[PDB]
Amino acid sequence: GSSGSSGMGLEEELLRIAKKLEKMVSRKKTEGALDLLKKLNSCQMSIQLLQTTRIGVAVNGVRKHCSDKEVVSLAKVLIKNWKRLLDSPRTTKGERESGPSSG
Numbered sequence: 001g002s003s004g005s006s007g008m009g010l011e012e013e014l015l016r017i018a019k020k021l022e023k024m025v026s027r028k029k030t031e032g033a034l035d036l037l038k039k040l041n042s043c044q045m046s047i048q049l050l051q052t053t054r055i056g057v058a059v060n061g062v063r064k065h066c067s068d069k070e071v072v073s074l075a076k077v078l079i080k081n082w083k084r085l086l087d088s089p090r091t092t093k094g095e096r097e098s099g100p101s102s103g
Contacts, residue, residue: 014053021058025065033062037074050086
């Protein structure tokens, strides 16, 4: 589109990031993943986008090709957070006292 970045998009930056990550993973380097991850964290992710940007696999790709803490951490958060965004359809269990207002 027109030159300059100011308005709507995200989906673009998201993809641009993935590519960067995906590339890094491919080249097995991952140097500036944090920066990428960071943005992601500060990028309104969505299920539909999770498929388009396919960043979900990008992050993991790093979290796997990276044993760091910060680069791995943020990556985890991206997974967790996305875990809620996408939260694929699966069965699970877990409950801790189900009773609001008890007293």
